[PDB]
Symmetry: D2
Subunit: 231 residues, 4 copies
């Protein structure tokens, strides 16, 4: 229905959200954005993108929230080519001081949210036989993370979920990938934050959005089921 | 005195055989819901048996704590602890529901969490212990037909590795064995697990095409539970005919 | 040094080599190229790139060939910002019918060649505290590959070598990554080169020690 | 042709070699041993195990050395049920100071030796439709090792080779596994006897349905 490709940025209030939208607009995408600010909307429109804001669902807490975002792309543009989300709030503390309630808390943010996003977006894309999905996550799930054992465990489920979804839809030509970043390990999202990461360097939000475009901008279609640790 | 082993569930699958292997090696036992026949057989092998009834599902922190407390109350020590858990749910991801995801998370992650949350503090206090979490091998790689189950099984294995890393300095070992024996139908007793029609469905999914007996499986588990070797920790070992 | 970034494409005779050069020329790089054709050189110069052809060293069979390519970048431009190679030829057959000669053969192309490339390029980049290296390989090393057991094994050594090198030079800001593709053993070469630019075009830093499979 | 199960311990001169043979003799195995000392032979014979010494081939440097050890089991007993080897010597130094000759050197000990062993033993076991092979290695392959980057890279090839061999022959009933130990890194650890007891889980016939596994045993450096 729409000649221009359509990208869904699930949340544009925080972290790399605004910069993803900027990169998408630079590459000729129209946009469905979770709770964008008025100045962000005007800025993207000055870059030539048509913007459809979706308000009130950027936390992706329910199956309905993700479906509302996917439905907004279909109603406005009739297509959904790219979709990206980030989620999850770190909880720290030794395993022997932890509680089952904390485990459920991180499971909700780290697993239920990517699950809901992909459950809504993947069927839209498989029917069109094209699509790129990026799940932005932590790298804590790749290996034991001292001080965040519960968080590391559920992040591992999220990455394996992405790999399972990708394997199931690989024949469709839909791509599903995950990128892990230290941006997701700090509740804010700089001196104190950098001191927690090994090399003491995060890079810029703009650089992060540029890297993410390798999995979202339509320039190549054969990477799927990958987890990449960024920076 | 005799070393003490907790077998969280002896109602199904490899539960009884784990108890047998421990009893053969001179362990006293805390067992979840053992049948009278199993108790008498284990007592003839020389083990003193402490049954814990009603907590074998590990559905609550209180259930796991009850099993750990029974070891301390009866024997004053807890040397080895093993549990198995989780029920496979099948179906393609695009047809799945959030409730199914939550369902498999409870059996595959919450149950091992509760078990280790109770058992690990007991063992670090004594500066010695072997814990084995028996799980599926589905978490190792994408599993066609069980994507949600595979995802949460991966959380369970990473949880084990995180716990193992945290307590590695304490002398406590925490390992995971993933097996197709965990992908069987639910609530299967010994005769059902050994039924040839049931076995053929699982054996067809492993590259070795054969699972072996549960007795052989329990013998392999003793390498992580019988006290014969120490320090190996944070390992995920597949006993699944080569699937992982 | 030159004020323009410099990319080394180790072999432009086959596969994605020419398209990698095209992407670099579009993105503001000057180029050091292994054995380019006259037509490729002329095309790239029409795109505004300065080209330094290196003749005879694209096999990376010796440390000296890899060093010659790195040395050519420094002599012409005084800098080397990006470096990419591909190597390895699939060897098939059941393990029980294989020979030690085949194992040694696959090790040369899959491991010795990336070793030689990184041994030459990494010291040049660590001195400048900046650089992006991409090793293009197979995806066979990630898991057992039926019919190619020896090839799969040495490919795993190549990926672990990339990870070890990346860890070693991470403090300098140099990035070292691997992309594994069935091209080494679909879509267009142009699409594949576009993906490779995420690890080579300077648009983001720090990402290092990653193995990404490009199906 | 011989009733007792038969185990090949490729090298009994160093490390866990002797303790592996002791465990096998305790489990009722007859033994083919690489360069056993006279005291070791007598001790194992006192355990009841029949012992066939193989001299001069324990380095597994050539395909013929590995084949000779497998041939010795078949000639003496007509069967080969279990086979275990260890190999490889750490090389240390920064990657930027390393040489291609060092890479080739570690490849020989870490990859060529297990290759030769498996290439000789696997066909013996597959014809039988039964067998257990254990490759004892380092855990350096699993993750980058800053001290020994070349060594870590080739150890990863050794573990992937084991996984590929296991996958190829999984249907035959032959199992092939790898155990990594810091005992392999010399120029907590636990005792050698404890290590050999753990190794029996993949070699004593008590379980036969695990293949393609890499297990890091113990910890320490």
């Amino acid at each position: 229905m729409s000649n221009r490709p359509v990208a869904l940025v699930s949340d544009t209030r925080y972290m790399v959200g605004p910069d993803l939208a900027r990169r998408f607009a630079e590459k000729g995408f129209d946009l469905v954005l979770g709770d964008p600010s008025p100045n962000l909307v005007s800025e993207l429109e000055s870059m030539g993108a048509r913007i459809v804001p979706v308000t009130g669902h950027s936390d992706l807490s329910s199956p309905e929230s993700a479906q509302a975002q996917a439905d907004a792309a279909l109603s406005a543009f009739g297509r959904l080519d790219s979709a990206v989300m980030f989620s999850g709030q770190i909880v720290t503390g030794r395993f022997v001081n932890s509680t089952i309630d904390q485990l459920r808390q991180v499971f909700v943010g780290c697993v239920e949210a990517p699950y809901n996003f992909m459950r809504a977006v993947v069927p839209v894309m498989t029917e069109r036989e094209a699509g790129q999905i990026l799940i932005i996550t932590s790298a804590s799930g790749a290996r034991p993370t001292p001080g965040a054992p519960l968080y590391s465990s559920v992040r591992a489920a999220a990455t394996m979920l992405v790999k399972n979804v990708a394997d199931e839809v690989a024949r469709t030509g839909v791509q599903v990938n995950a990128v892990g970043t230290s941006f997701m390990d700090f509740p804010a999202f700089r001196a104190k934050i950098e001191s927690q990461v090994p090399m003491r360097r995060l890079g810029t939000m703009e650089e992060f959005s540029a890297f993410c475009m390798a999995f979202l901008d339509g320039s190549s279609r054969f990477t799927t089921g990958q987890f990449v640790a960024y920076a």
